[PDB]
Amino acid sequence: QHLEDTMKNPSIVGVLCTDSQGLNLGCRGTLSDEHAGVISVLAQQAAKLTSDPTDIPVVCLESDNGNIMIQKHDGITVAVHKMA
Amino acid sequence: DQLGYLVLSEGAVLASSGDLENDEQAASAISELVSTACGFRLHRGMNVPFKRLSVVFGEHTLLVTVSGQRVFVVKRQN
């Protein structure tokens, strides 16, 4: 998907995919298996804040040590660490 | 601009305005999320997880900062 492009992206220093089930579905760089659960939870929780099924909720931790962006897609959760 | 306001303390609700007022379900949902988020460590002994926490949707978007046991939330358009 765009997923491949995310993985190939040199502006992104970490990425992790997961499920509502919190399994590690593929990571890279600064994100690893340890983070699966939490990112999963985060995404699921944010999706409880909208009732519109067309929304793609996005959780964004802004930090001086780079930003973390978590999108809840249907069937998959993508987390991205940008050294911005 | 501002669609609503929420501020929590110790986990309980301290103040609320706009869309966020008289909405327990939202309050506790946001509290849950924030707590989870605060429990996020990139590396070992990596604090704080975030300076700013956002949750963006189609039209609405929540903006959260945390200071002590006090949590501040706004609802915004765009």
Residue numbers in the entry:
A (entry chain A): 89 to 172
B (entry chain B): 14 to 91
Q: What did the original publication write about this model?
A:
Due to the lack of a transmembrane domain or a lipid-modified motif, the Rag GTPases are tethered to the lysosome by a lysosome-anchored protein complex called the Ragulator complex consisting of p18/LAMTOR1, p14/LAMTOR2, MP1/LAMTOR3, C7orf59/LAMTOR4, and HBXIP/LAMTOR5. The Ragulator complex is responsible for the recruitment of the Rag GTPases and mTORC1 to the lysosome and thus plays an important role in mTORC1 signaling. We found that the lysosome-anchored p18 functions as a scaffold to recruit the MP1-p14 and C7orf59-HBXIP heterodimers to the lysosome and then to form the Ragulator complex. We also identified two binding sites in the Ragulator, namely the α1 helix of p18 and the α2 helices of MP1-p14, which interact directly with the C-terminal dimeric Roadblock domains but not the N-terminal GTPase domains of Rag GTPases, and found that the interactions of the Ragulator with the Rag GTPases are required for their cellular co-localization and are essential in the recruitment of the Rag GTPases to the lysosome.
